[PDB]
Write a protein that binds this ligand. Structure first.
Ligand SMILES: [Mg+2]
Ligand SMILES: [Mg+2]
Lengths: 265, 265
């Protein structure tokens, strides 16, 4: 009886305003809304007010911070910490499951070397953001990406181990089915390793990163869904993807597909 | 109905000769023997002769190569490749499931940096190793170790992804329960990620790396065993560990404990 809690990033639903998109999401029973972190503090009232009376809640906050935490430049690491804290505080007000963060993209250089001593440093920095997140009633969430976008953190099991070592309820992780296609031999095993640390999930079609279903037989999430069920996953599965067809047609088709696959898992 | 195929490294069983140790192994129904690869070519006759008429086969070959494949010194990398090929040919003559290899230990320096370019080079080298091993009816087996011994390759999911990318019937991976204690949030998840590439398993007590059971309640392999059953694992589970107590008492106890947990999984 575990529920699939679907969520959408802000650009997913058709509509000319935030309220039109939310109406569309309510029609489909999509219960999570995932905004970007950019300017979030200034959007708290807008978002709260649009959600009032709806069966929709803020799920994760997708990034939005400046700089990156593995820069060799302490000023850039501080920029990342400071901008993350601004977002975290707004995320807390919005009841968010947490703020998504990539430690370093490929092109974010110069970066600290990929060594154990750097990993310890990352864990310390994340412990500091997590303590702040927890005070604000939220978390920070490591996102692994595939090799085309990052090398540092690519697999859910790696992110989960970081979280276990940090041992902070404000420090969690996630898996993105797009990235997992390229970096996980098993979506199920990855999510199982995620376990109690798995705070969010991203979903997209698995060849073109468009709406689930637009890549036909490649868009198979059953193995991952079996992992989510085995861990009792109770957070959101949120769309982060493009769109090839007519959004009024393909968005509902994606929701239908994920629900069918959830039932089969 | 999946069977647990127990194996011992050479120093596990009590005895003053290889034949005495094998006699002890047969009495406990341990069917796998795991010798080190050091001077293996020169022991092929010895091992064949000792195994004649016995219900014991060679399982994996534990390392034995010189140098390391991630050295910045081409001569050291070549030493690794050349000595691995010697061992691989002997492994094949002995019907081994594969030769275990760690890309780089912490003290093996200077080493290539942990970057995507190094990962590509590692894949090229293992592909060469694997083509040779397949020709000889065996494999090479990546072993992830914990942070106290290595940084480069620590998790089963990472090793499995290397195997998937290399895509060679001669290149496989393993999990060692000792190392997994420190590097895996889920033994089940780790082995599920291992999947079709999982070729061997090491077992030890989980606090002091001694005989299973010597660390009491910490010596729980159920979760991992569930993962092995879920993937239809049909290779060996091999003891690589020390011994705190009377070897004549604690070795049979460890075998008994593992068989009990396997039945519970
Ligand atoms: Mg994502
Ligand atoms: Mg081992």
């Amino acid at each position: 009886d575990l529920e699939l809690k679907l969520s959408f990033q802000e650009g997913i639903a058709p509509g000319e305003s935030l309220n039109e998109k939310l109406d569309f999401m309510e029609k489909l029973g999509v219960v999570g809304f995932e905004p970007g972190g950019g300017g979030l503090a200034g959007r708290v009232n807008e978002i709260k007010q649009a959600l009032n009376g709806r069966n929709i809640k803020v799920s994760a906050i997708c990034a939005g911070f400046k700089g990156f935490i593995l820069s060799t430049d302490p000023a850039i690491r501080k920029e990342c910490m400071d901008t993350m804290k601004e977002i975290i505080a707004a995320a807390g007000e919005l009841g968010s499951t947490g703020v998504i963060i990539v430690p370093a993209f490929n092109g974010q250089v110069p970066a600290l070397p990929h060594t154990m001593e750097t990993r310890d440093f990352l864990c310390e920095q994340f412990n500091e953001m997590g303590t702040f997140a927890a005070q604000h009633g939220t978390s920070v969430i490591f996102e692994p990406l595939n090799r085309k976008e990052c090398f540092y953190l690519r697999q859910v099991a790696d992110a989960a181990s970081l979280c276990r070592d940090i041992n902070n309820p404000g420090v969690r992780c996630m898996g993105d089915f797009w990235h997992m296609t390229w970096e996980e031999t098993s979506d199920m095993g990855a999510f199982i390793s995620g376990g109690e640390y798995l705070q969010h999930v991203h979903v997209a079609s698995r060849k073109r990163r468009s709406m689930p279903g637009e890549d036909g037989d490649a868009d198979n999430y059953i193995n991952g869904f079996k992992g989510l069920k085995m861990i009792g996953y109770n957070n959101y599965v949120s769309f982060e993807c493009g769109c090839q067809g007519d959004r009024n047609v393909v968005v509902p088709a994606a929701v239908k597909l994920l629900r069918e696959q959830w039932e089969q898992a």
